[PDB]
Amino acid sequence: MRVVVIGAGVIGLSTALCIHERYHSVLQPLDVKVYADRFTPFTTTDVAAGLWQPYTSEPSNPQEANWNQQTFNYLLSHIGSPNAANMGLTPVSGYNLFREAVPDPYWKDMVLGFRKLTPRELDMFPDYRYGWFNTSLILEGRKYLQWLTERLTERGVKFFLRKVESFEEVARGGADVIINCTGVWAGVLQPDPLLQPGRGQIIKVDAPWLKNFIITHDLERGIYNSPYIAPGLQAVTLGGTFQVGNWNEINNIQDHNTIWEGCCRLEPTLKDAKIVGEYTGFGPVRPQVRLEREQLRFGSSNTEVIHNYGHGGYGLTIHWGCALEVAKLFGKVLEERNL
Amino acid sequence: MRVVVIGAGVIGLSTALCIHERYHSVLQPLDVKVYADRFTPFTTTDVAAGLWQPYTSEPSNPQEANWNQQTFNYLLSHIGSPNAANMGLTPVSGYNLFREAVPDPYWKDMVLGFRKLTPRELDMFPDYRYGWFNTSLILEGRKYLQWLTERLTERGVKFFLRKVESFEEVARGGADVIINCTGVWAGVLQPDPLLQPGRGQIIKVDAPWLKNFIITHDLERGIYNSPYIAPGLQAVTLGGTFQVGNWNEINNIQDHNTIWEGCCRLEPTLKDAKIVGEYTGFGPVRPQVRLEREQLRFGSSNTEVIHNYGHGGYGLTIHWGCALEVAKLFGKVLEER
Ligand SMILES: Cc1cc2nc3c(=O)[nH]c(=O)nc-3n(C[C@H](O)[C@H](O)[C@H](O)COP(=O)(O)OP(=O)(O)OC[C@H]3O[C@@H](n4cnc5c(N)ncnc54)[C@H](O)[C@@H]3O)c2cc1C
Ligand SMILES: Cc1cc2nc3c(=O)[nH]c(=O)nc-3n(C[C@H](O)[C@H](O)[C@H](O)COP(=O)(O)OP(=O)(O)OC[C@H]3O[C@@H](n4cnc5c(N)ncnc54)[C@H](O)[C@@H]3O)c2cc1C
């Protein structure tokens, strides 16, 4: 059939590949197109800090916690392969700092080497008085997208620069199944007021001497609203602002002063570090991920649509669970239609 | 006081700065000079991986364990300064890998978060069964000598590019005190059967994705001679164990392959690492450090010599304790006048 995938971020390409891997052979070719108005380096995925860490509390949906662990073990299976780093993948250890005792997270056993910080370690951080150490994985969004873009291309999947104006335009274009991987902009094709823009701004620096990640938490302020330092492959990511409901795509001086001063308080060696750039992106924030099937009809046309959007703060930490799951839903469509 | 420090590696320059910090005030006539046939970047100190880790089993001199511990506390007390990475200093986390269970080292509680590797960690390393995880410090030899040089220079200490043929000749130059930090070449000025060269070839690569050191210890053998991978401030250092007794400064194809093949199998992502250099150094291997005082009469020419050499593959790890010790013994020269 004719599958169209709208969106070239981590969700869009994890999904296009996951589907194509399973539902393709040499005498059952599955025609996949990828329509998208933004490709790497210009997606929200290229901004993502890179790191694998879910939210501290165990999530409401029991499927989301599976999607996290399935994602972790999928990436961890590549650690030791010659091409881990070429996917944007490498191991990284680090600190999570709190201003007060909190329960161990639900993923203490998912990560490698979890443990509490000793008193000696906590004096390294004057402003904080409790926390953890653990080993995890960098998945550099910019790289992973380059790699996924190439695996798709080897397999014959084709890409088109195209702003989809409605699901119908793509339906009349002659598309049997559509995968809706438009992230924060999903609300334009079909309204969805539960989906807000999580506006985060980051500073990227050269500070290759920084090797561990350092993630502070403010529980009052919620996730990403407190300084984090994340070592990348070529550069350190500096962050600490996340504004839910702000659609301003401009970088601004208020966020710079917050990220810069907060991060220099943790890591004073950053006074020298050259700023390479500053970027803003929109987490597709949503109380839950919309990952479901929905048939549509129009005047001269009708179609099958699968949603994969609203991952918010955890696109890379969950993309593969979400993709495996879309490919099953897609399997159901081919089962029901005698293909 | 006329002091001559022979040597411009870590030992000589740390020892010159201790001495000066602790005595420029009290002794108003204090003139220190640094003689060396090599300065940075040509010292064995510069070749080193720059990593705080003592030897696995315990030392012979128990003084050595306290000099190590003193060094760690000193460097750690700069973690928090804005000028730690300009000093050559930054934390690093990493893995020690073994082919059998071994007792925990005497330094487990000096380093941060010392701990055994779990099974999924050990699954990441197919040819290894046991190990430790801990967070230590990188002290980049090259960058630290630079810091040390600028410090000593504001302080007025004078440097001279110059080869010493004997202790005798420095002493007739008016040298009251001679601090002997000549590393592996110390035998030239006074025979020492115990001092051999730990020759170690290394490969510097451009591989900034690697955030953790990985050290192997193949205590018998298994072709690869314990490959290690140590991330630096910019480049990574690949290497093996020392070949003791070898004085050959030339790089050889035999050792390149051992190191490259052996480390590539430790960390396969090394396949696309740009090689930036390949250098050979000589550790001052000796069953225990020689940190002691000795006097020399060459007629009615009087001189105090304080030896601070023989630090093995651990001189960056132990430097500051020794430098401090040599400060004390220098006081007990001043004391006797
Ligand atoms: C500062 C910051 C740091 C973050 N750090 C991390 C992190 O460390 N770890 C983590 O797991 N997650 C992190 N995230 C979250 C992560 O960025 C997102 O969850 C993820 O990138 C969203 O993936 P996506 O593919 O749904 O959307 P996107 O990456 O934005 O991709 C959307 C694609 O759909 C296309 N599109 C949209 N509408 C249309 C249309 N009408 N027609 C055609 N194409 C369309 C776009 O052009 C684009 O190609 C972070 C977010 C921010 C802001
Ligand atoms: C491959 C390698 C890796 C290593 N890795 C580590 C590590 O990760 N961590 C660690 O702690 N240690 C490490 N070391 C050990 C460390 O390099 C040595 O212990 C340390 O450099 C010894 O310092 P030094 O000042 O005694 O020697 P050097 O740096 O060799 O300094 C010797 C000085 O004496 C001078 N000199 C000698 N004779 C004369 C003379 N007659 N006249 C004038 N000048 C003279 C030389 O020119 C030089 O200035 C490593 C060594 C090697 C070879």
Curated annotation (Swiss-Prot), chain A:
Q: Give the pH dependence of activity as annotated.
A: Optimum pH is around 9-10.
Q: Which Pfam families match?
A: DAO
In alphabetical order, the GO MF annotations are: D-amino-acid oxidase activity; FAD binding; glycine oxidase activity
Q: How is its activity regulated?
A: Inhibited by benzoate, sodium benzoate, thiolactomycin, and hydrogen peroxide. Inhibited by 6-chloro-1,2-benzisoxazol-3(2H)-one (CBIO) and benzo[d]isoxazol-3-ol (BIO). Malonate and meso-tartrate has no effect on activity.
Q: Does the keyword Cytoplasm apply?
A: yes
PTM per Swiss-Prot/TrEMBL: Phosphorylated in the cerebellum; probably not by PRKACA, PRKCA or PRKCE. May be S-nitrosylated, which partially inactivates the enzyme.
Q: Which UniProt keywords apply?
A: Cell projection, Cytoplasm, FAD, Flavoprotein, Oxidoreductase, Peroxisome, Phosphoprotein, S-nitrosylation, Secreted, Synapse
Q: List the disulfide bonds.
A: none
Q: Where does FAD bind?
A: 8-11, 37-38, 43-45, 49-51, 163-164, 182, 283, 312-313, 315-317
Please write the reaction equations for the catalytic activity of this protein: a D-alpha-amino acid + O2 + H2O = a 2-oxocarboxylate + H2O2 + NH4(+); D-alanine + O2 + H2O = pyruvate + H2O2 + NH4(+); D-cysteine + O2 + H2O = 2-oxo-3-sulfanylpropanoate + H2O2 + NH4(+); D-dopa + O2 + H2O = 3-(3,4-dihydroxyphenyl)pyruvate + H2O2 + NH4(+)
Tissue expression, as annotated, is: Expressed in the liver and in the kidney, including in epithelial cells. Not expressed in the lung.
Give the main location.
other
What switches on expression, per the entry, is described as: Repressed in conditions of amino acid starvation in an autophagy-dependent manner.
Q: What is the effect of changing residue 307 to L?
A: Reduces activity
Miscellaneous note, as given in the UniProt record, is: Variation of pH perturbs the enantioselectivity of the enzyme towards some amino acids.
Entry similarity comment: Belongs to the DAMOX/DASOX family.
Name it.
Answer: D-amino-acid oxidase
What gene is this protein translated from? DAO
